[PDB]
């Protein structure tokens, strides 16, 4: 009847890890050149029982490594001719053009660690996940950088999922993951060699697909705001990299007017430009001017970065933080460690 302290070894109790993951992945392309020495060949090839875990995508740490490895890749591979760091410091580089087409990479746990995965389709957010499994490696993610539309990512399993740390507040973004992709075809045709045009381009979006998609999004948004009509608007202002929709294909820096999407095919007017701001930190960079021949991007719109007005309701596109883009894919994973030692009350005593 006397209660005593006893100790057990092999107790399966988890704590969050602070470790570093390794990269695994699969012709001079810069990501392939990098991967050649940066990543290992991939793994050629476990649901847990009645467990619950509080995954929190906005407070994760897998993100910092992803957002350090990509800057290193990018900065080494895409050299500006002029790079200005703020006094100021200006350096220059040789500027050959390079092939640029992002490839998937996987993050994998080092010895002693494992990655928890949330398998709940109706993920919702930072609340408890009641469907948890374990892996060594995450699925492959293409480190695509873009601003208003999230391109070439994964799709929601069944329904559009709106994930936001605080929907009500509006000082935070809303990440919308689509359960369907919308195809977009962007190109700069030949016979556009004028100086006053090599910097002009256009994009085609299926009219029906876009309209079907927004109707589905609105039906989901109305759950939070059931008494209001939802109106989409264009951007408010600020740096051009985020005012309009920016992306990069073939090494060229593209900007597109998305007003017609948030106001046959829908045609957007796009431009290519030599002077850009950096996303790597505060500063500017100049890249060598465009080349001749037809240029084309082919992509899947898989999501949106939206914000909502404060004080009928209005939403508009925005973005600029590559970390937000990384979260949209890494939200399902957490890395943990095991501390195999515990204490419990018992009903025995040591002979003394």
């Amino acid at each position: 009847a006397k209660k005593w302290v006893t100790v057990y070894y092999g107790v399966p109790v988890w704590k969050e890890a602070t470790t570093t993951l390794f990269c695994a992945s699969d012709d001079t392309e810069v990501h392939n050149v990098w991967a050649t020495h940066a990543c290992v060949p991939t793994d050629p090839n476990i649901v847990l029982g009645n467990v619950t875990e509080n995954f929190n995508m906005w407070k994760n740490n897998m993100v910092e490594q992803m957002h350090e490895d990509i800057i290193s890749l990018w900065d080494q591979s895409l050299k500006p001719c002029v790079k200005l760091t703020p006094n100021t410091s200006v350096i220059t580089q040789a500027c050959p053009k390079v092939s640029f087409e992002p490839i998937p990479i996987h993050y994998c746990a080092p010895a002693g660690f494992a990655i928890l995965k949330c398998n709940s389709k109706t993920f919702n957010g930072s609340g408890p996940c009641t469907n948890v499994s374990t892996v060594q490696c995450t699925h492959g993610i293409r480190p695509v950088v873009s601003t208003q539309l999230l391109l070439n990512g994964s799709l929601a399993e069944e329904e559009i999922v709106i994930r936001s740390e605080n929907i009500t507040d509006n000082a935070k973004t809303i990440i919308v993951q689509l359960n369907e992709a919308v195809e977009i075809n962007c190109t700069r045709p030949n016979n556009n060699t004028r100086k006053s045009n090599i910097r002009q381009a256009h994009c085609n979006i299926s009219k029906a697909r876009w309209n079907e998609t927004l109707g589905q999004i609105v039906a989901k948004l109305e759950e939070q705001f059931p008494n209001k009509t939802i109106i989409f608007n264009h951007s408010s202002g600020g740096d051009p990299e985020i005012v309009t929709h920016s992306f990069n294909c073939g090494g060229e820096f593209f900007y597109c007017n998305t007003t017609p999407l948030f106001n046959q095919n829908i045609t957007l007017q796009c431009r290519i430009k030599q002077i850009i701001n950096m996303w790597q930190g505060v500063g500017k960079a100049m890249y060598a001017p465009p080349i001749r021949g037809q240029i084309r991007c082919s992509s899947n719109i898989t999501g949106l970065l939206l914000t909502r007005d404060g004080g009928t309701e209005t939403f508009r596109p925005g973005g600029g933080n590559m970390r937000d883009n990384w979260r949209s894919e890494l939200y399902k994973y957490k890395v943990v460690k095991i501390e195999p030692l515990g204490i419990a009350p018992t009903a025995c005593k040591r002979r003394v």
Partner: protein, 124 residues
């Protein structure tokens, strides 16, 4: 595999019962280079931690053991629950979380007890 008994997902009581059964059955007998090496590195680390822990536990008088009974009484202020409430309804994760802030106190006491007993025995 540090989770020798596989208790994540079930309560502690069930885990102990499962061990007894499995131990009985076991005694009774009832890219390919890269991942090849990584698979072993993981096992070697786990072995080393295991062997290490088994002797570190001698500080509390529990070396060479998976389960070790004490001479330090439970302080009810650390839980105020019965044996069956804890062993039948809680998982190890729930349990350690419940008492997460008394760990250093308890470990300290276990060391102290072991020291006193060693002293007493050498005095004779």
């Amino acid at each position: 595999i540090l989770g020798f008994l596989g208790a994540a997902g079930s309560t502690m009581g069930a885990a102990s019962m499962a061990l007894t059964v499995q131990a009985r059955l076991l005694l009774s007998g009832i890219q390919l280079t890269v991942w090849g090496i990584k698979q072993l590195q993981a096992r070697v680390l786990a072995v080393e931690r295991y062997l290490r822990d088994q002797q570190l536990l001698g500080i509390w008088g529990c070396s060479g053991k998976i389960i070790c009974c004490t001479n330090v009484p439970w302080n009810d202020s650390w839980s105020n629950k019965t044996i069956n409430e804890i062993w039948d309804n809680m998982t190890w994760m729930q349990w350690e979380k419940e008492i997460d802030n008394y760990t250093q106190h308890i470990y300290t006491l276990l060391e102290v007890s072991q020291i006193q007993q060693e002293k007493n025995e050498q005095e004779l």
